[PDB]
Symmetry: D2
Subunit: 179 residues, 4 copies
């Protein structure tokens, strides 16, 4: 009970989610055997997926994070964001995998990809657990995706609403009476 009471629907179940994270983990492990793999996730939304995915990757990898913010209304038209916390690991010549919790319009993601490319990684690929194909507003290639979902107000496994529901073990839709 408690948070699970506010959930109106369960798009992806706990076990359903676990199996996919494990699956993606095997694919990544194989495509990156030999290669300097560095996982970069954007706080805070990606902590849940980052934690599970890295454990599902039997490889010597590094983890780092990025905290960004909005320039008001230039972020929504161009996806331009302010870097609050830059990553500390030097990614030049390394294989970087961007870990996202969800990709919808993809504006901010396309922008971060470009910014990260300017630091010369040997390669840069993107991985998401959630993805809203409808939503797409920018040309971004997701190299690893988890599930495709309808544009509903979802939460859980990192995703939130007013900082809440990040700890739900599944992906559910909040009752429209809460938002």
């Amino acid at each position: 009970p408690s948070p699970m009471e506010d959930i109106e629907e369960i798009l992806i179940t706990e076990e359903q989610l676990k199996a996919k994270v494990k699956e993606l983990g095997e694919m990544i492990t194989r495509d990156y055997e030999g290669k300097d793999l560095v996982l970069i996730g954007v706080l805070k939304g990606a902590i849940m997926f980052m934690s599970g995915l890295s454990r599902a990757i039997d490889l010597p990898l590094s983890i780092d994070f990025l905290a960004v913010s909005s320039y008001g209304s230039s972020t929504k038209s161009s996806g331009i964001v302010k870097i609050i916390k830059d990553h500390d690991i030097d990614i030049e010549g390394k294989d970087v995998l961007i870990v996202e919790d969800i990709i919808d319009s993809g504006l901010t993601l396309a922008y971060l990809r470009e910014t990260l490319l300017g630091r010369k990684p040997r390669s840069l690929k993107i991985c998401t657990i959630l993805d809203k194909p409808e939503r797409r507003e920018a040309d971004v290639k997701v190299d690893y995706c988890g599930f495709k979902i309808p544009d509903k107000f979802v939460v859980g496994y990192g995703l939130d609403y007013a900082e809440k529901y990040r700890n739900l073990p599944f992906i559910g839709v909040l009752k429209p009476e809460l938002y």
Copy 2:
């Protein structure tokens, strides 16, 4: 294989670790039913423990992080650190739980506790998965602890060495030939 090959000993096993995280989760859930719970962890070491613990807490909680750095040699004598990434959630009047991956000397922890107290949380408690009683150099009260361990160079479940081994599902000791 791969990273598990560099491990010379396994102090806490995968399942051993999982059960304890679950245990602490039940205790926290009960002590905080009713109360505005906010979990603050210090990057990057605490991401692994944060992720598992919050899922093991059936409560409406908020998560936030802190990124700190060293002032050189004032950090080792006083535990004074520079705030690279401050927390965004306003903790005044809220119940804050500090989530650490490991507590050894406790200097930096005692300092962060004091700094966080200046922001007036309704309460401030500390939780760790790992703890080296020997190590203690400051007076810090750990309200929730996981395991007590000997002062050996350990890694895994968040803890690292040159940014590596954070993704190990267990707590092991690295072979002295690597450090």
Copy 3:
């Protein structure tokens, strides 16, 4: 011109210049022999920090703080989130917080308490402008420039929607702009 938005000048460029020189002399005498570190809060303190540090004939270091608001905590007890911490280790050092203006003094009291926790040998405050009738905190100002009425002032670092920081004098903004 940026200057045409002013209702009246309160302090001329020459007044500021002279007051800054005066404060510089005092600080030079008082800190002779000490390990002085000047810390200003961005972005307001920029002009004053620049002129003041140049008027102090001592081997000082300079650093900066960038802070933000939490919302309620900030307005009530002056609690702020730090966006940019100072890099210099102020332990055992004689620190001087340089501010552009102190009115309520809430945020300042919080920052002083915060820096004290880092063990400076001493900590004092320096402001170029001051609005006494607006205090809300029991803060002590060790070096003060001018005391001014509670008017909407801009110039010499003080802004309004980011504008007017570059005026070489302190003036009152015309009400048709706020």
Copy 4:
């Protein structure tokens, strides 16, 4: 005194003051009618930013960048980690990067490429000092103050282990200190 550590003065306080005025006039003419945002890199650009912004009779905004080194990437291709991003939205704005000194120009070229990605209407560079014989990057400087030899200079923002930033002139440090 801080001044006793100098081997020779290169540019006097009056030279700087006059050069700053001159640059201010040029920028005022060139940016009349535009949306000017000045961005300096902390902490070196502080003195120059202060004097320059005051010498420009235009409605400008001011912001700052705080950067750090990655290690190899920084030294090789001038790539830096940002510790403090600018807060003002520079999209569709006429931005002017204000620097204290450009020698190799590596880090500057990287920051210019980085700010271009944020879509300013225009982006230019302004430095008070310049060491041409030390270039390592194909960077274009739109407004320059003085060209100087490859000497260890301090003052007017330039430091050495955090000291000497407060000298009102540019001088060469005595070798018995490095």
